[PDB]
Amino acid sequence: DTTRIGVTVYDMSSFITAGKEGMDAYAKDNNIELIWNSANLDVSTQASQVDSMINQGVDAIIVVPVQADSLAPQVASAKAKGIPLVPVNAALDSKDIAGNVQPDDVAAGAQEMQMMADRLGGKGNIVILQGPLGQSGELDRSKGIEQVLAKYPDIKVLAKDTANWKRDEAVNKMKNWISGFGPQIDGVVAQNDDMGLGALQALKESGRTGVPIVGIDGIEDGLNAVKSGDFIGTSLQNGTVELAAGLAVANRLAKGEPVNKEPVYIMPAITKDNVDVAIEHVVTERQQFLDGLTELINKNLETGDIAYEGIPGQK
Ligand SMILES: OC[C@@H](O)[C@H](O)CO
Numbered sequence: 001d002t003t004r005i006g007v008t009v010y011d012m013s014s015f016i017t018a019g020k021e022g023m024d025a026y027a028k029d030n031n032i033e034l035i036w037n038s039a040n041l042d043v044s045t046q047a048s049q050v051d052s053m054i055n056q057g058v059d060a061i062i063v064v065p066v067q068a069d070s071l072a073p074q075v076a077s078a079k080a081k082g083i084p085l086v087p088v089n090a091a092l093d094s095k096d097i098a099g100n101v102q103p104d105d106v107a108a109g110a111q112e113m114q115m116m117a118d119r120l121g122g123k124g125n126i127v128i129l130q131g132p133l134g135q136s137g138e139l140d141r142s143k144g145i146e147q148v149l150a151k152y153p154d155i156k157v158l159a160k161d162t163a164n165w166k167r168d169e170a171v172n173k174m175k176n177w178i179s180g181f182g183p184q185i186d187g188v189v190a191q192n193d194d195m196g197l198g199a200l201q202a203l204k205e206s207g208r209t210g211v212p213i214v215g216i217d218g219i220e221d222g223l224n225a226v227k228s229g230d231f232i233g234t235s236l237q238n239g240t241v242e243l244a245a246g247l248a249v250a251n252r253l254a255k256g257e258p259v260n261k262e263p264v265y266i267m268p269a270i271t272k273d274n275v276d277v278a279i280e281h282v283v284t285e286r287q288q289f290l291d292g293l294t295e296l297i298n299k300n301l302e303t304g305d306i307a308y309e310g311i312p313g314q315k
Pocket residue numbers: 013014015016089090137165191192193216217237
């Protein structure tokens with residue numbers, strides 16, 4: 001019979017919106033019904049959504065948490081009712097969950113900042129666009145960015161602020177920074193591609209181009225920016241793969257089947273060197289890719305390498 005898995009995401013970001021197709025594909029191949037909800041970047045709303053899924057007696061719950069330091073009563077309630085609660089993509093600061101399917105966000109932060117350090121030759125002024133404040137990917141990517149910045153004291157941070165993963169909020173923040181700092185800005189380090197693209201749109205609207213921008217995710221428009229040189233690079237977080245892996249882990253936990261409950265998604269570097277294959281998987285041959293996805297996920301669960309999808313460089 002049908003395994004009902006609740007999924008409550010922080011918001012319908014570009015990453016989550018594209019990723020969900022991977023979840024759908026794995027679910028069709030495994031008779032899983034997804035019970036969906038999005039929490040508007042509101043912790044109390046997400047809490048209520050988890051509570052509702054518990055009351056509905058779903059077989060497992062995936063949470064993509066608004067903030068890391070939250071949801072303790074929902075975590076305990078799920079455990080109390082025997083329902084596996086599995087943070088996927090963003091993390092909770094709790095060990096009372098049933099599984100945990102996460103990217104290495106500290107590593108991705110460091111990787112993006114290292115791309116920017118290389119481009120700049122270790123010197124220059126940057127601004128940093130952050131994810132939602134208190135969300136694990138914001139905290140972790142900040143940590144990784146700061147660990148590289150320590151190694152490059154001639155790189156100076158002019159400002160940093162959140163744009164909540166959103167392109168339109170990033171345009172706004174960048175427009176203000178252009179008015180404040182103008183020609184001092186030598187680079188933009190965006191904690192995701194969407195915010196990088198907003199920064200790009202702001203720069204262009206002010207008549208400035210060729211400013212180095214780096215992002216994380218490799219969404220369609222980010223990959224396109226890498227190809228065209230509007231971005232210096234990105235880090236692939238293919239949500240069709242990572243979210244389907246989280247779904248697979250939750251499904252096996254729901255059914256009492258043996259599984260690695262805590263695989264980690266290592267984001268490969270995307271540059272002009274390998275962007276074409278990423279574009280094939282994510283954009284132009286996406287249906288080919290999805291046709292092989294269930295097999296890929298099932299293998300990757302046993303190797304632990306849940307990011308593997310044959311991007312040149314991966315082994
Ligand atoms: O889903 C949260 C992050 O992993 C993602 O990078 C946001 O675009």
